[PDB]
Each structure stands twice: as C-alpha cells, then as structure tokens.
Design a protein around this ligand. Structure first.
Ligand SMILES: NC(=O)c1ccc[n+]([C@@H]2O[C@H](COP(=O)([O-])OP(=O)(O)OC[C@H]3O[C@@H](n4cnc5c(N)ncnc54)[C@H](O)[C@@H]3O)[C@@H](O)[C@H]2O)c1
Ligand SMILES: NC(=O)c1ccc[n+]([C@@H]2O[C@H](COP(=O)([O-])OP(=O)(O)OC[C@H]3O[C@@H](n4cnc5c(N)ncnc54)[C@H](O)[C@@H]3O)[C@@H](O)[C@H]2O)c1
Ligand SMILES: O=C(O)/C=C(\O)C(=O)O
Ligand SMILES: O=C(O)/C=C(\O)C(=O)O
Ligand SMILES: [Mg+2]
Ligand SMILES: [Mg+2]
Ligand SMILES: [Mg+2]
Ligand SMILES: [Mg+2]
Lengths: 339, 342
C-alpha cells in the first residue's frame, strides 16, 4: 500500500546545523537552491565553469567547483544531466563525500545504469520531483508544492529517510505529497512520459493544425484552437484538479459536451497503444539508455540539429506569427529565484 | 495570407460606444456570468435575462438586475445571447425578435445558430458574433489581472453602421481586446470550434488515458501513472506554457537533456495516418450537417443521453484513479468564492 508523506510527516529538524550542496544550478538546481535558502537551510552551490556558475553568484549563493561543494556538505543533491553523473560521481563526489553524508539524485536513471552507486559509510536516495523548476518556485512562494517520488537506496546512518523528507519539506514537495516509488520504476515511468506521451500530445495538436490548414481554415485561428489560445492547456491543468471528463461537464456548453462525448474513447487506432508499448520496451530493455549515451556525443550535437529543425516546422512558424499578433497572459519572472 | 488578418487590441476599441447604453446578458452560465461580471466592473450598465432556474437566483445573489428574457431584451440597446445553441431558435422567435429595439445589436458567442438559420438578421437591427476562445473562469481571472483571452468576431448585419465599434466596445469591456479580437466568418468559427471539441479535446484525453492504461497493464503504480499522464499538472503546465513560447520551445527550455533526447526520438513519429483520417471524418460530420442533426436529437428530454455519458465517464478507470490520487495529493488551487461579485 502507498507511503505518501505530506507536511505532517516531515520536518526541517534533521537539517539543523547541516549544509546542503546543490550540484548544478539548472532547471532543478536553481529551484532547490532558492527554496532551501528561503526555508532557512544552509546551502552552497557546486558547478563547473559555465553560465550557471555566474548565475548562482548573481543570485547571491556561495558557489565553488563541485569537489569543494561536496567536501563542505552533509547532504549532496546531484542536479546535473543524467549522462554526466558517472564521471562527476567518480572524480568529484565519491572522493569527497563525508562519512555519514547523504547523496540524492532526482531521477533513477544513473542508479539503474550503475553510474551512481552506494558507498560504504554513506546514504544514497532518490527525490524525484514531478514538475519543472519555474512552477516548483512559483508554487513555493505561494505556500504550495508539486508532488515527488522518493526511494532510500542505501542507509548507513539509519537517518536517510527523515533527511530526504526534510529536503522535500524545505523545497515544498510535502505540500502536495511525496510517495515512495522504486528508483527503477521512477526511471521507466519518467522516460515513458517524455518519449510516448509528451511527443504524442504535441503531434496530436500539430495534426489538428495541419488538417485545419489543409481544409482551408485560417492558420492563426487553427493555431489558437489547437493550443495557442491556452484553452487546451487550461483544460489539462484544471483537469489535474477535478478530472478531465469533469472539466468538460463543468466548463463545456451543452454543444461542446455532446460533441466531446460523441468521440470520447473512439479517436485512437490500436497503432497508438502498440507504439506506447514499443516505447516502453525500448525504455525497460536498455535501448533508450544506449541511444542517450550515443546522443550525449559532442555535447548533444544531434539534439542541437533537432531543436533548430523543430522551430522551422509550420506549427512553430505559425506560433511566432500568432504570438506577435495576440498578447498571452504572462507574469514578470525577473528575480523569481532571488531571496 | 498572414498579412490579411484584421486583429483588434485595446488601441483599436473604446467604451465610448456604450455610453448611456444598457447591455442585456441573456443567460448567466459559463459565458453569461463572466460577461455580466466584467461589463459591470468596466462601468457598463448591464442586466440579466434568464429563465426560472438556479442561474436566475445566482445572478440575483451576485447583485444583478434579473428578469425573464423578454423584459431584459425590451430594456436593452445591446443583447448578448449566452444560452446553449440548441435553445437559440425558440428564445429568438418568442422572447428576443418581438422585443429587440429599433437599432439594437444582437450578439451570439458561436456561429452555429447563424449557420442553421435559428438566429437571423432583422430589418432595422444589427447582428454579430463575438466568440471567446476560452471558458468563463479564466476570462474572469484574466480580467481582474488586467489580461484577457482571444476572441473571433463577425458583423453579420449592420443596419446602424455602428455595429463594428459596438461589438468591439463589448469586447474591450469584457477584456478580449487585451489579447486580440480577430475577424473570422461565423460559418468558419462554427466548424473550427466544433472540430476542437469533437476531434482534438477527446483525442488529447484518449491519449492521456492510453498512457495510463498501458502503464497500469505493465505493472506501474496506478497513482504514479495517473500523476505522470496529467495528475501532477506537468502535462497541463507544458501545454499552457507552450501557448506562450511554443510547445517544442518548452521542451528545449524546461527539459533535462535526457528528456529532450527522449522527446526528439519520437517527435513527429508517434501517430499513424489513421489519426489524421479520423480528424477529416470528424470535420466531414461537422461541415455537412451530420453533427447538427446529432446535436438536435441529443438535446431531447433535456440532454438525457449526455447525462448517461457524463455518469458513465466517471466510472472509467482513469476517473476512479483520479479520485484516489486527488484525495492523496494536494493540488495547488486559488480560492474562487466571490470571483464574480463586483
Ligand atoms: N528538468 C526538470 O524539470 C527535471 C524534473 C525532475 C528531475 N530532473 C532531473 O534533475 C537532474 C537535473 O536536470 P535539469 O533538467 O535541471 O538539467 P539542466 O540541463 O538544467 O542542467 C544544467 C546544469 O547542469 C550542469 N552541467 C551540465 N553538464 C554538466 C557536466 N558535464 N558536468 C557537470 N555539470 C554539468 C550545468 O552547469 C548546470 O548547472 C537530472 O537528473 C534530471 O533527470 C529534471
Ligand atoms: N462554455 C464556453 O466556454 C463557451 C465559450 C465560447 C462560446 N460559448 C457559447 O456561449 C453560449 C453559452 O454557452 P455556455 O457554455 O455559457 O452555456 P451554459 O450551459 O453555461 O448555459 C447555461 C445558461 O443557459 C440558460 N439556458 C439553458 N437552457 C435554456 C433554455 N432552453 N432557454 C433559455 N435559457 C436556457 C440557463 O438558464 C443559464 O443561464 C453558447 O452559444 C456557446 O456555444 C461557450
Ligand atoms: O471555447 C471554449 O472554451 C468552449 C466552447 O466553445 C464551448 O463550450 O462550446
Ligand atoms: O518531470 C519533469 O518536469 C522533467 C523531467 O523529468 C526531465 O526534464 O527529465
Ligand atoms: Mg519527469
Ligand atoms: Mg463551442
Ligand atoms: Mg470554443
Ligand atoms: Mg525526466
């Protein structure tokens, strides 16, 4: 049965007098470091020589190379790209991790692949948020949080669980709920969302756009309806609260509800479920992991080509025209991660 | 051609056309309540026309002048018909057409009743569409934050010669010009809107549900499966942030390199030709009147079949798991009480 920890099941007491080293200052690192500091936890940043080092300095952190950050830490959070874990673990972290220190990863992939391993005399855990950095930070400032999964991999001290959950409470995840989930299951589940569901959702939106344009509809209007208006995003985000079918029952005109229920459960051929299973097979059997290791070559050169090509697609050419023509509601983001 | 679009923002509209004029909001539902609240807060005289149901009493509780539909229309310079589309014909013929003042403007928020001839131009009066691209709660939240949602508009009949500026004055008062109000024919709006509702929304939910089903079959924790496919809010946040910056751009900005490599392995490759073929079949049903005939049947005995569909949907594994997850994990929400009070 599920172990789910909220604020009533965790406290900041395990962090009293302890220093947390945030290794990395990217999407997750910057949010962890800002929320730890604002929760009254002693925090320092370990980072390589790049723009993120200078950003952490600009945002008032104590910033050093990774080895020095680890040497001064009771708890180490490894918040860099998963393919970089092995080399940073072997050279910078393992030689410097204090006796009884806790190392946490935010994704199980390096644990599954054996690139991060238990060390005699130390604790090892996963604390894997189910959300990206900007919302984790916005939620934090509003007294809210995003869910996370956790796993205690090695517990020399016997205190790893309460220390991991104290980090979770300091960063805000216990405000939603932190659920026990094995690091191997987290790895495969996370990769499936990234490789099947996210591309399929965008491909579906793009298909709607392409069919409307082919059938003679105004391209700006087509782009707005399939996502650009924010209606489809709002339906999916409100759906997280109340349920997706319930959003239609509450917010749809009767015309909309009759239309939706004419095709609900009937839109997809078997090829979609079949492809989902094929993607999960690639994830569970190591095919994706071998692909990722290849792709990390030349600092992800192939991904650079894919990112640049995607911007040239009709959907993204139309996006730029629609976004220049219609003002989208935005909140100022400058200084979001300052104290 | 991109260059040919007519898009109106705040710089292209004003409230001057509404000076001394009363707007009758007919209906107080998802759209009606947002229009009435925003018109009032924009300093526009507004009254509500509504049948004898809970929405009449809600409009009273929220401080409006509320009467039957005929009386609201008889006292109005501008009439906004914000009731379900299948009810337009009977309300138009009995309650609106006999009471619409000489030179008055009637607006609909969807082209369907215009396509079907259930709402028609009247000698001496103006007729228009102002069709929001968002539901009521966000229209209201955006309004209070100095923001708005897009809308499409069409001037169908313009006896006065003033219909365009009066429609755009309503749009400015309700907030749509803060985003942009684009000229689009009522027939095109009808088919485009119905396509989003009948192909895209069900396909997105069907896809989320497919992800959930496959994970549960393959032995994944059902709460975790539900959270990842939408329950965490991550997929909704990605699609809503995507509206701002682009969907591929959200992944480039907010994805780990692991996530981006995974996404681009399958981007543009996940769907078989059968999906675009079904989209074309749905559009054929919409363009040729098949959906309109289905809607007229379904409206029978106050949408009894829709009641059966709504209740059956809640029993699907996805929605059983939703209730378990939502009880176990706190989702960030804003207090909504009094959102539509002055
Ligand atoms: N992006 C998310 O929302 C998210 C959510 C949950 C979990 N995760 C996990 O969090 C971890 C961090 O991911 P992210 O998305 O924040 O990454 P990111 O791409 O934002 O990481 C950038 C950071 O990594 C550092 N870095 C990059 N390459 C490095 C290398 N070779 N050696 C040392 N440092 C290097 C940079 O200096 C910078 O501090 C990963 O394990 C990822 O799977 C990410
Ligand atoms: N729901 C949306 O977000 C949305 C967005 C844009 C356009 N629209 C359009 O706005 C209009 C109103 O839709 P809605 O979603 O607000 O509807 P709704 O289901 O919320 O409408 C309920 C309202 O309609 C009234 N009503 C219901 N049946 C009636 C009848 N037979 N006679 C008279 N009044 C009746 C009720 O008293 C109440 O005031 C429609 O033309 C719809 O297509 C809806
Ligand atoms: O655009 C919307 O949000 C909703 C509709 O068009 C509807 O419910 O009919
Ligand atoms: O969960 C997320 O938001 C993002 C990831 O898992 C990722 O970028 O790897
Ligand atoms: Mg993830
Ligand atoms: Mg509609
Ligand atoms: Mg619509
Ligand atoms: Mg991930």
């Amino acid at each position: 049965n599920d172990l789910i920890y909220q604020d009533e099941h965790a406290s900041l007491q395990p962090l009293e007098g302890r220093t947390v080293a945030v290794i990395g200052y990217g999407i997750q690192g910057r949010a962890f470091a800002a929320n730890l500091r604002d929760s009254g936890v002693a925090v320092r940043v370990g980072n390589i020589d790049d723009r993120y080092f200078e950003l952490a300095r600009a945002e008032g952190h104590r910033v050093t190379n990774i080895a020095e950050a680890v040497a001064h830490a009771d708890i180490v959070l490894l918040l860099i790209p998963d393919e970089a874990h092995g080399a940073v673990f072997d050279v910078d972290i393992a030689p410097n991790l204090r006796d009884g220190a806790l190392l946490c990863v935010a994704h199980g992939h390096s644990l599954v692949q054996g690139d991060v391993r238990p060390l005699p005399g130390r604790d090892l855990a996963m604390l894997a948020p189910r959300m990206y950095g900007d919302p984790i930070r916005r939620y934090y400032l509003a007294g809210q949080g995003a869910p996370a999964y956790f796993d205690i991999v090695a517990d020399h001290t016997g205190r790893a669980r309460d220390r991991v959950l104290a980090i979770a409470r300091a960063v805000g995840f216990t405000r939603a709920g932190v659920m026990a989930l094995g690091y191997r299951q987290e790895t495969f589940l996370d990769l499936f969302q990234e490789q099947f569901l996210a591309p399929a959702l965008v491909d579906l939106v793009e298909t709607g756009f392409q069919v409307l344009v082919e059938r003679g509809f105004n391209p700006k209007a087509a782009l707005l309806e399939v996502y650009g208006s924010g209606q489809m995003g709002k339906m999916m985000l409100d759906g997280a609260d109340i349920g997706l079918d319930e959003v239609v029952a509450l917010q749809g005109s009767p015309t909309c509800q009759v239309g939706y229920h004419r095709w609900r459960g009937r839109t997809l051929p078997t090829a979609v479920r079949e492809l989902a299973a094929r993607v999960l097979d690639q994830i569970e059997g190591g095919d994706f992991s071998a692909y990722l290791k290849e792709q990390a070559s030349n600092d992800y050169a192939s991904l650079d080509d894919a990112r640049r090509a995607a911007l040239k697609r009709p959907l993204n050419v139309a996006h730029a025209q629609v976004r220049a023509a219609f003002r989208f509601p935005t909140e100022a983001a400058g200084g979001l991660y300052q104290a």
